Design an enzyme around this catalytic site. Structure first.
Site, PDB file in Angstrom:
ATOM      1  N   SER A  17       4.423  -1.096  -1.438  1.00  0.00           N
ATOM      2  CA  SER A  17       4.974  -0.270  -0.379  1.00  0.00           C
ATOM      3  C   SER A  17       4.089  -0.275   0.870  1.00  0.00           C
ATOM      4  O   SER A  17       4.537   0.226   1.898  1.00  0.00           O
ATOM      5  CB  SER A  17       5.227   1.146  -0.864  1.00  0.00           C
ATOM      6  OG  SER A  17       6.175   1.184  -1.927  1.00  0.00           O
ATOM      7  N   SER A  33       8.838   6.577   0.953  1.00  0.00           N
ATOM      8  CA  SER A  33       8.624   5.227   0.471  1.00  0.00           C
ATOM      9  C   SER A  33       9.925   4.699  -0.156  1.00  0.00           C
ATOM     10  O   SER A  33       9.966   4.298  -1.330  1.00  0.00           O
ATOM     11  CB  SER A  33       7.420   5.204  -0.469  1.00  0.00           C
ATOM     12  OG  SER A  33       6.568   4.124  -0.141  1.00  0.00           O
ATOM     13  N   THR A  49       0.593   4.731   0.895  1.00  0.00           N
ATOM     14  CA  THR A  49       0.379   4.437  -0.518  1.00  0.00           C
ATOM     15  C   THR A  49       1.190   3.220  -0.953  1.00  0.00           C
ATOM     16  O   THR A  49       2.182   2.870  -0.316  1.00  0.00           O
ATOM     17  CB  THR A  49       0.889   5.584  -1.396  1.00  0.00           C
ATOM     18  OG1 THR A  49       2.207   5.897  -0.945  1.00  0.00           O
ATOM     19  CG2 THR A  49       0.039   6.830  -1.340  1.00  0.00           C
ATOM     20  N   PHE A  64       2.272   1.133  -5.047  1.00  0.00           N
ATOM     21  CA  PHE A  64       2.195   1.097  -6.502  1.00  0.00           C
ATOM     22  C   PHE A  64       3.220   0.096  -7.023  1.00  0.00           C
ATOM     23  O   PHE A  64       4.386   0.197  -6.673  1.00  0.00           O
ATOM     24  CB  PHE A  64       2.480   2.485  -7.077  1.00  0.00           C
ATOM     25  CG  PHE A  64       2.597   2.586  -8.579  1.00  0.00           C
ATOM     26  CD1 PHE A  64       1.680   1.968  -9.416  1.00  0.00           C
ATOM     27  CD2 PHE A  64       3.592   3.363  -9.157  1.00  0.00           C
ATOM     28  CE1 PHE A  64       1.771   2.105 -10.793  1.00  0.00           C
ATOM     29  CE2 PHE A  64       3.676   3.503 -10.533  1.00  0.00           C
ATOM     30  CZ  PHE A  64       2.767   2.872 -11.349  1.00  0.00           C
ATOM     31  N   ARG A  81      -5.909   6.882  -7.181  1.00  0.00           N
ATOM     32  CA  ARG A  81      -5.851   6.099  -5.962  1.00  0.00           C
ATOM     33  C   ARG A  81      -6.166   6.942  -4.733  1.00  0.00           C
ATOM     34  O   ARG A  81      -6.429   6.349  -3.691  1.00  0.00           O
ATOM     35  CB  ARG A  81      -4.515   5.379  -5.793  1.00  0.00           C
ATOM     36  CG  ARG A  81      -3.473   6.161  -5.028  1.00  0.00           C
ATOM     37  CD  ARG A  81      -2.180   5.402  -5.037  1.00  0.00           C
ATOM     38  NE  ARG A  81      -1.123   6.373  -5.009  1.00  0.00           N
ATOM     39  CZ  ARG A  81       0.149   6.063  -4.948  1.00  0.00           C
ATOM     40  NH1 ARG A  81       0.514   4.807  -4.785  1.00  0.00           N
ATOM     41  NH2 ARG A  81       1.046   7.018  -5.067  1.00  0.00           N
TER      42      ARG A  81
HETATM   43  C1  LIG Z   1       6.054   1.203  -3.281  1.00  0.00           C
HETATM   44  O1  LIG Z   1       4.920   0.743  -3.512  1.00  0.00           O
HETATM   45  C2  LIG Z   1       6.467   1.971  -4.503  1.00  0.00           C
HETATM   46  N1  LIG Z   1       7.018   1.095  -5.537  1.00  0.00           N
HETATM   47  C3  LIG Z   1       8.198   0.760  -6.044  1.00  0.00           C
HETATM   48  O2  LIG Z   1       9.278   1.060  -5.595  1.00  0.00           O
HETATM   49  C4  LIG Z   1       8.016  -0.006  -7.302  1.00  0.00           C
HETATM   50  N2  LIG Z   1       7.990   0.555  -8.445  1.00  0.00           N
HETATM   51  O3  LIG Z   1       8.248   1.771  -8.659  1.00  0.00           O
HETATM   52  C5  LIG Z   1       8.172   2.383  -9.961  1.00  0.00           C
HETATM   53  C6  LIG Z   1       7.657   1.430 -11.051  1.00  0.00           C
HETATM   54  C7  LIG Z   1       7.255   3.605  -9.865  1.00  0.00           C
HETATM   55  C8  LIG Z   1       9.581   2.825 -10.315  1.00  0.00           C
HETATM   56  O4  LIG Z   1      10.069   2.592 -11.415  1.00  0.00           O
HETATM   57  O5  LIG Z   1      10.316   3.471  -9.407  1.00  0.00           O
HETATM   58  C9  LIG Z   1       7.609  -1.427  -7.279  1.00  0.00           C
HETATM   59  C10 LIG Z   1       7.687  -2.279  -8.392  1.00  0.00           C
HETATM   60  S1  LIG Z   1       7.035  -3.840  -8.043  1.00  0.00           S
HETATM   61  C11 LIG Z   1       6.679  -3.282  -6.442  1.00  0.00           C
HETATM   62  N3  LIG Z   1       6.102  -4.034  -5.515  1.00  0.00           N
HETATM   63  N4  LIG Z   1       7.013  -2.005  -6.179  1.00  0.00           N
HETATM   64  C12 LIG Z   1       6.984   3.384  -4.217  1.00  0.00           C
HETATM   65  N5  LIG Z   1       5.716   4.064  -4.016  1.00  0.00           N
HETATM   66  C13 LIG Z   1       5.223   5.151  -4.627  1.00  0.00           C
HETATM   67  C14 LIG Z   1       3.798   5.173  -4.434  1.00  0.00           C
HETATM   68  O6  LIG Z   1       3.256   4.250  -3.648  1.00  0.00           O
HETATM   69  O7  LIG Z   1       3.097   5.966  -5.006  1.00  0.00           O
HETATM   70  C15 LIG Z   1       5.887   6.056  -5.387  1.00  0.00           C
HETATM   71  C16 LIG Z   1       5.211   7.245  -6.121  1.00  0.00           C
HETATM   72  N6  LIG Z   1       5.663   7.655  -7.491  1.00  0.00           N
HETATM   73  C17 LIG Z   1       5.763   6.763  -8.500  1.00  0.00           C
HETATM   74  C18 LIG Z   1       6.174   7.148  -9.785  1.00  0.00           C
HETATM   75  C19 LIG Z   1       6.476   8.479 -10.053  1.00  0.00           C
HETATM   76  C20 LIG Z   1       6.355   9.395  -9.013  1.00  0.00           C
HETATM   77  C21 LIG Z   1       5.939   8.960  -7.745  1.00  0.00           C
HETATM   78  C22 LIG Z   1       7.380   5.899  -5.478  1.00  0.00           C
HETATM   79  S2  LIG Z   1       7.809   4.192  -5.560  1.00  0.00           S
END
Ligand SMILES: *C(=O)[C@H](NC(=O)/C(=N\OC(C)(C)C(=O)O)c1csc(N)n1)[C@@H]1NC(C(=O)O)=C(C[n+]2ccccc2)CS1
Ligand SMILES: *C(=O)[C@H](NC(=O)/C(=N/OC(C)(C)C(=O)O)c1csc(N)n1)[C@@H]1NC(C(=O)O)=C(C[n+]2ccccc2)CS1
Lengths: 248, 248
Positions: free
Chosen positions: A50, A98, A189, A191, A233
Site C-alpha cells: 500500500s 488504504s 503504512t 502490509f 511496524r
Molecule cells: C496495503 O498494503 C494493504 N494490503 C492489502 O490490501 C493486502 N492484503 O491485505 C490483507 C492480507 C490484510 C487482507 O486480507 O485484506 C495485500 C496483499 S498482497 C499486497 N501487496 N497487499 C492494506 N493495508 C493495511 C495496512 O497497511 O496496514 C491494512 C491494515 N489491516 C490489516 C488487517 C486487519 C486490519 C487492518 C488494510 S489492507
C-alpha cells in the site's frame, strides 16, 4: 543519490526483543545524514504494497485520471475485502483507509506506458511493473528498498519529483496523520499479508516527521508471518525515534 | 453573493448559558446552505485579530516575501511577548502559535499598496488598510463579518482565491489542527484583548471540518471582557457542531 548512512546496531535491540527481522532508516534534514540498524537490509528491495499509493496518487493527478483534489470515489455497491472500504471516499480518505480497489481502478486508467514512464521519472525501485497492470505492486515484480523510499519521500517533501508542485502538495495533504502546533507527521503504512513461514510477508511504515524547524525522514519494513506482530511496524520506529529525541 | 442563511434561535442556548454575546455561522457543503443563531450579528464586521494570518500568509507567498513553505523565520534573541514565540518558526509553526511579530515583519515587507490590492481581490472585509502598515488588523480599521469569513474560507478550500493554487495549498496545510483517517479540521483562533465592559474585545474561531465526503465551514465570534471566558470560542462551536452530528 548522495546518501550518507551510518550503521548503528544498538538499534537492533528493539527488533531482537520482539523476535523480528527488519530495518529502520532515519534521516535528519536530508539524505546526507542517515542512520540504520542494518546497512544490507536498508538497501534490499521489497514489495511496496500500500506504500505504492503515494506515487500512484501523484501519477493519477499528473495524468488527469484523478480530476482534482476534491474528487469523490463512489462505492458501486459491490462488496470489498474490508468493510471500511465499502463507502464513498475522498482521495485522502482512500489513502488513509488504504482502499486498494480505488487505486487498482486509477492504475488501469493510467495504463502501463504512462505508469512505466513515471516510475522511471521517480526512480521508484526496480521499476518492474509486470505481473498485471492492477497488481504489479501487490503480488507482481515491483520492489523498492527503505533507502529508496526515503530518497523518494525527500524529493516529495521538497517538491522535486517530476510532477507539478500542486500535485505533490495535494498528495502531501492526503498523507498527514498527526497534527499539533509544532509537530506534524506525514506517513503511509503497508502490509502484504502473512505470506507463509518459509516466505514471509512484508510490513512497511514510511514517512516524515516535522518538529520545530527540523524534519526527519523514515522508512521501516519487517518480515511478518503473523498478523499479531503487525503493531510492531509502528512501535519499533516510534521507540527508536523516542530514544533519539524526536517523538519523546 | 449567493449565500443562503437561516436563523435558528435554539443555538442561543449555549451562548446564554455562559452569559456571552456572540455569533456562530455553520454551512454544509457550501455557502448555499448556512445557519446562524443571529442574522444581524452574522453580518456585522469585527476586527479579525489573529484570523488575519490566513490572508496575510497567502499574500506573503504571492508577493514572494515568503520564499516558500520551507522558509524558517529566525528569532533575533530579543524579547517577544509570548515565550512560545521566542524560537525559530516555520510558516506553519508561526501560524499555529499565532506569532504576531513574524507576521508584522511579513506585512511591513509587503507594504500598504500590495496589501490593499490583495484584500480587494479576496473581498476581505471592509478592505480598510488605513492607520499605517504597522496596525490595520491590530490597532487599525480592518473589520470582517462571520459571513465574510465563511465565504473567504470556502474560496480557500476550493482553491478559488485569486492566488496560485500552490500558495493556497501551502496555507491550508499550515492550518490543519486535527487529522484522522476520515476526519480533518483546519482552524484558526483570534483574540483582540479584553477591551472594556463598555467596549469589549472580540474572540474568534474559524475554519472548516471535513467528515467522510462532506465539508462544513464555520466562523464564531464573541464579545469578551474577561480572559477567563476565552475557551468558549472553541467549546461553544464544538457543542453546536456535536448536536448537528458533526463532531464525530
Ligand atoms: C496495503 O498494503 C494493504 N494490503 C492489502 O490490501 C493486502 N492484503 O491485505 C490483507 C492480507 C490484510 C487482507 O486480507 O485484506 C495485500 C496483499 S498482497 C499486497 N501487496 N497487499 C492494506 N493495508 C493495511 C495496512 O497497511 O496496514 C491494512 C491494515 N489491516 C490489516 C488487517 C486487519 C486490519 C487492518 C488494510 S489492507
Ligand atoms: C491574535 O488574535 C492575538 N493577537 C494579538 O496580538 C492581540 N492580543 O491581545 C492579547 C494577547 C490579549 C494581549 O495581551 O496582547 C491583539 C491586540 S489588538 C489586536 N487586534 N490583537 C494572538 N492570540 C492569542 C490567542 O488567540 O489566544 C494568543 C495566545 N496563543 C499563543 C499560542 C498558541 C495559542 C494561543 C497570543 S496573541
Amino acid at each position: 543519490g548522495h546518501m550518507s548512512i551510518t550503521e548503528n546496531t544498538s538499534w537492533n535491540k528493539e527488533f531482537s526483543a520482539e523476535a523480528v527481522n527488519g530495518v529502520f532508516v532515519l534521516c535528519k534534514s536530508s539524505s546526507k545524514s542517515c542512520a540504520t540498524n542494518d546497512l544490507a537490509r536498508a538497501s534490499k528491495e521489497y514489495l511496496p504494497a500500500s506504500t505504492f499509493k503515494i506515487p500512484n496518487a501523484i501519477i493519477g493527478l499528473e495524468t488527469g485520471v484523478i480530476k482534482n483534489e476534491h474528487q469523490v470515489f463512489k462505492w458501486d455497491g459491490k462488496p470489498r475485502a474490508m468493510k471500511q472500504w465499502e463507502r464513498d471516499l475522498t482521495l485522502r480518505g482512500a489513502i488513509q483507509v488504504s482502499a486498494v480497489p480505488v487505486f487498482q481502478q486509477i492504475t488501469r486508467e493510467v495504463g502501463e506506458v504512462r505508469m512505466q514512464k513515471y516510475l522511471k521519472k521517480f526512480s521508484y525501485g526496480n521499476q518492474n511493473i509486470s505481473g498485471g497492470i492492477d497488481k504489479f505492486w501487490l503480488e507482481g515484480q515491483l520492489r523498492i528498498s527503505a533507502v529508496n523510499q526515503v530518497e523518494f519521500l525527500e524529493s516529495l517533501y521538497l517538491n522535486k519529483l517530476s510532477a507539478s508542485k500542486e500535485n505533490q502538495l495535494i498528495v502531501k495533504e492526503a498523507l498527514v496523520t498527526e497534527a499539533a502546533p509544532e509537530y506534524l507527521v506525514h506517513s503511509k503504512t503497508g502490509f502484504s499479508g502473512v505470506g507463509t513461514e518459509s516466505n514471509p510477508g512484508v510490513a512497511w511504515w514510511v514517512g516524515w516527521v516535522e518538529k520545530e524547524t527540523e524534519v526527519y525522514f523514515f522508512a521501516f519494513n519487517m518480515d511478518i508471518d503473523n498478523e499479531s506482530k503487525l503493531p510492531l511496524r509502528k512501535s519499533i520506529p516510534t521507540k527508536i525515534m523516542e530514544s533519539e529525541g524526536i517523538i519523546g
